[PDB]
């Protein structure tokens, strides 16, 4: 699937046309993106946690809590298993996340989550042949404090490369948990990507 979560919020368009414009490719309503644009601005998420599904998250959340970062979670997580979906909201309790993205294109029982006072969104999409650069969400998040990515354990060599490639192309750091030789800092050794 593809779905993000949101904390209870409190007090929160401005001078920002290009940012909400980039949300329009994936976000549906024009005010849909407009509300999820203010998602990234207020808390100023400074860390993106990338994972798959569970003890991996407490490692990266510790690693997100390892640089004074107000992190934002992202992971695959496909099917149901008690809690999980229910514990999505507890990530904000346990780890103190500012938002959690979960990657079920249909069904999309988002009202299972937003019933208990947790704002949510909807789909986005995966592999695409250079129609719309999805990766620039890192750039909009970068302007909203995103100083580093943090890759939890278990990410495939593609998701590791994709997140490390996103670390290069957007001036973001990435923290691991190839991940043990010089490739742990490939985005810094090679700040500019290649062929």
């Amino acid at each position: 699937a593809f779905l993000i979560v949101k904390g209870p919020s409190e007090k929160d368009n401005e001078q920002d046309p290009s940012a909400i414009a980039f949300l329009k490719q994936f976000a549906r309503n024009h005010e849909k993106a407009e509300r999820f644009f203010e998602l990234l601005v207020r808390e100023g998420v400074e860390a993106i946690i990338i994972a798959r599904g569970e003890r991996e998250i407490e490692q990266a959340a510790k690693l997100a809590r390892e640089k004074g970062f107000e992190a934002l979670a992202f992971l695959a997580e496909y099917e149901r298993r008690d809690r999980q979906f229910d514990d999505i909201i507890e990530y904000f309790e346990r780890y103190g996340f500012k938002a959690v993205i979960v990657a079920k294109e249909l069904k999309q029982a988002a009202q299972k989550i937003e019933e208990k006072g947790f704002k949510a969104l909807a789909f986005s999409g995966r592999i695409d042949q250079e129609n719309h650069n999805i990766n620039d969400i890192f750039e909009l998040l970068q302007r909203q404090g995103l100083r580093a990515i943090i890759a939890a354990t278990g990410l495939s060599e593609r998701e590791l490369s994709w997140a490390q490639r996103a670390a290069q192309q957007y001036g973001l750091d990435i923290i691991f948990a190839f991940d043990e030789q010089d490739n742990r800092f490939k985005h810094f050794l090679e700040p500019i990507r290649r062929q």
């Binding site: 046309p17 290009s18 940012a19 414009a21 980039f22 329009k24 490719q25 250079e130 129609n131 719309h132 650069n133 620039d136 750039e139 970068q142 302007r143 100083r147 192309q169 957007y170 001036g171 750091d173 043990e180 030789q181 010089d182 742990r184 800092f185 810094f188 050794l189 700040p191 500019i192 990507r193």
Partner: protein
């Protein structure tokens, strides 16, 4: 095929009145790289929307044409920090020496990522003109700039950075120390041996990891024994690195330190002493 039907199609969408269609056409121009798109994106470097400027700047570095340098050079002074980053990133991807002095100015930017990427860009260009300004960026308050400046100073490999990087092995952040150690390893100066030896006693398991690999790159023998106690490191990879870094600094000094570890060594220190004394 890289048919020009899609090429000139996105090209005409750069003057579209929709922001989304503009930068999404600029991104396709970068992924296509057809050089018939240099001038249209240079005009898009001043689009009223920053993302179209960001995407066109990035796409100009994706095509890799000399005609984008001076436009991106002016795009370094853009009002939007992301466009400043994208232009500094693209200039590093083009790597033309015209961008050195502008990126040296971008080393004095306000976005700690533009200065970070200007450092990384100046490292890719490798112009020795950028050495002294990068040394000033070893004092930038942002650690990612100090670290990117250190990485760029090591990629340039100019000896002028050795002692600035030597004093950067005592920086409060462990990532810039990771870079200063990796940098001094690439530069391979005998001056850095003693400070990297002291960096082997660092609290960070990554600074010890780099300082071990650095001294393996330097190939100096004053760090043979400091690498032996590094073979008793609590971090697994610092141990394996010192095993790699000692096979580099070959000779009898490492051999005589192996026969005393094939005899009286324990743990991982004995593990590689026998394997080295096997494969001399």
């Amino acid at each position: 095929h890289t048919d020009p039907e899609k090429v000139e199609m996105y090209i005409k969408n750069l003057q579209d009145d929709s922001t989304t269609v503009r930068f999404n056409a600029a991104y396709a121009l970068g992924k296509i790289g057809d050089e018939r798109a240099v001038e249209p994106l240079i005009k898009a470097l001043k689009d009223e929307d920053w993302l179209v400027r960001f995407s066109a700047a990035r796409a100009l570095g994706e095509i890799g044409d000399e005609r984008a340098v001076e436009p991106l050079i002016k795009a370094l002074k853009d009002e939007d920090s992301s466009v400043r980053f994208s232009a500094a990133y693209a200039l590093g991807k083009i790597g033309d020496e015209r961008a050195v002095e502008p990126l040296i100015k971008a080393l004095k930017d306000e976005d700690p990522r533009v200065r970070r990427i200007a450092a990384g860009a100046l490292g890719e260009i490798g112009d020795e003109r950028a050495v002294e300004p990068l040394i000033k960026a070893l004092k930038d308050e942002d650690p990612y700039v100090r670290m990117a400046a250190a990485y760029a100073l090591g990629k340039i490999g100019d000896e002028r950075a050795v002692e600035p990087l030597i004093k950067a092995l005592k920086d409060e952040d462990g990532y810039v120390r990771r870079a200063a150690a990796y940098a001094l390893g690439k530069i391979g100066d005998e001056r850095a041996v003693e400070p990297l030896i002291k960096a082997l006693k660092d609290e960070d398991e990554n600074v010890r990891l780099a300082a071990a690999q650095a001294l393996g790159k330097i190939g100096d023998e004053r760090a043979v024994e400091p690498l032996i106690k590094a073979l008793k490191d609590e971090d697994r990879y610092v141990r394996l690195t010192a095993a790699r870094a000692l096979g580099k600094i070959g000779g009898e000094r490492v051999r005589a330190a192996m026969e005393k570890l094939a005899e009286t060594g324990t743990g991982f220190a004995r593990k590689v002493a026998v394997n080295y004394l096997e494969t001399h």
